[model samples]
Target: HWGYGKHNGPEHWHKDFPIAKGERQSPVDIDTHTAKYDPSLKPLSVSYDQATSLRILNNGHAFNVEFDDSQDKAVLKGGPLDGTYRLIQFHFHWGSLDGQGSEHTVDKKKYAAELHLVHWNTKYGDFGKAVQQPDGLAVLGIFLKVGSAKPGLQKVVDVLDSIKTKGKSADFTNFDPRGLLPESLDYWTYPGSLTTPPLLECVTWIVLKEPISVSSEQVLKFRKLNFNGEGEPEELMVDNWRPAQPLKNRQIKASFK
Candidate 1:
């Protein structure tokens, strides 16, 4: 029931969700200079079955592409993971304007956008139960930069028009999120919490250093989204990202030197 607005935004979330003020809250500033390089970090292994992509929906806060996690067919391994993590869904966070949208930043620099590919550890068995345990989730963050238009992402953008209103959903299939990532897999890792309520500290954060390209025009379509449902006064859905939280004695580990 929490939303990003004047009265219901990130600032007010802590009032009802105490964990919002927790030490490991997400969307932290990653200072590359200080992040220690880990020689033991393994190469990321992402194997997703495109057929698992079930549907796309406008969840009032943002658009999400849900996946069938009934099995480990679409799983993420290596790069700071102990066991297989099944892909559940993917979504984005952006600002109302360019250069101010991304949830996580590099050396204090914001990006045009940010994408979150959410996965849950198999040990806990299900997303609901896993989300409450430490090391239950691993969210992959891919930074989005403005440049040439990204054809790979057009498939997702094209669907926004049909599901513009909150709660609108459409059957979407056969799109592989891996194709949307950058060529390099270099990244930084840390322990953090869900960026939203209940702000559970159950995520092992893996943020890639390389960013994918997209046009500024493609980025604006996200703002056209509405926070309210159909037939309601349209509240433009923008700035749905949480501000950077304090690192708080956490050490950031880098995959590559």
Candidate 2:
């Protein structure tokens, strides 16, 4: 299995998945000074139904909050998108300490954590098929910083006790993802990949400019998860973020100045 370790880490992923070297790879650094401000870009339209949140899972990679994407219960439009994208799931990446685990960086500075809300285009029919096309996915990236306890994130924290090990899961519904977002809807848009294998180059990344706050104690709950499943050696699930990839010739567009 591919993981962030010495033997089977990112350095060796190219051996198994040739797409690892793709030019449109994700987690690229966003230099605000170089990003072009687009006046035509519309404000992001997010419509999330709390009831669509089905369950939560620990997939040995990250803890994911799955949504019922079969219908148009939750959808995202605008923000450089040509069509609506349905929310499938949301996950996070973090490090053992603050400023060490975020996948995407801003001007070479990393955040305490990074949250990815994965969505797929409706024109493609489903996530499995859409993931292969260039315009298949639209990921909303949210940055987190260490601060006061986030009341909006308390429900997600409460579920950590039940899914302390890999493969463990529990019912997690009625949680509005909007509660987790920053007040501003402005973002930086780009074309990138999954940040993980299969590393598909199909994500239209909408990374928010403002970051939300979380507490140091709340971060402790994320660090408690083990990469291995229950009854296995305790491998702390930390620093699961992929390093920033080369920007190549891609342009970063901003929704705000």
Candidate 3:
């Protein structure tokens, strides 16, 4: 029952999940000045099938839009990857306010929110098996800033009312994720783990440099969702982002100068 509360938050996670202190932890602050541009890194290629979007769920933490990955209908390729990675699900992390929310920061600057498209290597057979390997997962992070409303985001927000409580879910089909991406694919690559508990150090993180836009009014809708499940003391689901972790000895490589 780990949560973002003061009693069970990120700082206290090390007691239950010792790997919280492990090296290569995720959501590291990206110091752009220190990041080296790699000429050999290829541009990222993403192809998503709208039909593959199955449903959206509020899993007590953040809302996630799941995809059908039984086959390779949707995937991520290139840009520091060796093979195609199948899309499993995509979720978001945000703050209670618009000033700070994104998990990963650029030169200490935080965005309004962040989107993570989770994928697993096909070479490892399946997500369960692939997650055990160091090269198992590849997550694409897109930062969200407050501005004009994003049409892609509006679709997700419209369904928030149906999943106001934890464990609640709704059908979310025919949604193409490409609409949520920024104009550029430029990103920073690093080796890291899941930002949340079970904090597995098995992800190859690819965080985009450009941020997408969403209106401040739309972001406030997310606050209406509850952290607690139905029948419990109601708690608003805000500040669902983990603070930035130590970079340690890891090097962040940039795809552009």
Candidate 4:
């Protein structure tokens, strides 16, 4: 299984998953100076139903808050997306300390953490089919810096105790993800792949220019979770972020000047 451990980390992923070395990899270092502004890009529209939140689970790599995508209750449209994309789940990548954690960096600056809100194209019929297509997925990335505790984040933190080990899950409903987003929708869009293994080159990355705030203590709570299962030896789930990959031939576009 792929993990953040020394023996099975990002560097070793290409051994089993050849796509790890493919062009258009994700979590790229966003150099603002080189990012071109495109007025043609429309504003992003996100409409989420609070009740669509299904459950929260610790999937060994990261903790994911899954959503019920049976209908268009929670969908992401506009921006770089061609059609409506259903919200499948949202998860965070964090560091062991405050100095570094985020997957995608801004001007080579690292944040405390990063949030990925994953969505699948509706035209692809289902998420399974979408993963195989070039225009299959769209991931909204929000950087998290150290600051005052955020109320929306607090709700997710409170449930960490219940899912301290890998493969653990608990009911998580009525949590609106909109509260976790930054005020501005300005973003950098590019073609990229999943940061983790089975790194499919099907994601259209929409990384927000603004970052949300989360207190250091609150971020520390996430480090309390374990990468190993309940009975296995304790291994803290820290620095779960994949390092920035090469930009290759992809051009980063901005929604704002």
Candidate 4 TM-score, true structure as reference: 0.98
Ranking by lDDT: 3, 4, 2, 1
Model 2, runs deviating above 4 Å: none
The residue-level lDDT of candidate 4 at 94 comes to: 95
> Model 1 over residues 149-188: C-alpha lDDT tens digits?
8887888988898898899999988888877789998999
Clashes of 1: 0
Per-residue error for 102 in candidate 2, Å, reads: 0.8
Off by over 4 Å in 1: 49-51
Q: In candidate 2, what are the lDDT values of residues 1-257, reduced to their tens digit? A: 99987787778888888888889998999999999999999878988753388799999988999999988888999989999999999999999899688999999999989999999999999999999899999999999999987788889988988998888999997888988988898899999999889999999999999989999988888889888889998999998999888999899999997
Candidate 4 per-residue lDDT, tens place, 31-96, comes to 999999998998899887533898999999999999998788888999988999999999999999
- The residue pairs in collision within model 2 are none
Candidate 3, 57-133: lDDT as tens digits: 99999999999998988899999998989999999998888988899999999999999999999999999999899
- After superposing all C-alphas onto the true structure, candidate 4 shows an RMSD in angstroms of 0.9
Model 3, 175: alpha-carbon shift in Å? Answer: 1.1
Error of 4 at 106 (Å): 0.9
Error of 3 at 233 (Å): 1.8
- Go through the candidates in order and give each one's C-alpha lDDT: 0.90, 0.91, 0.93, 0.92
Cα error, residue 11 of model 1, in Å, equals: 0.9
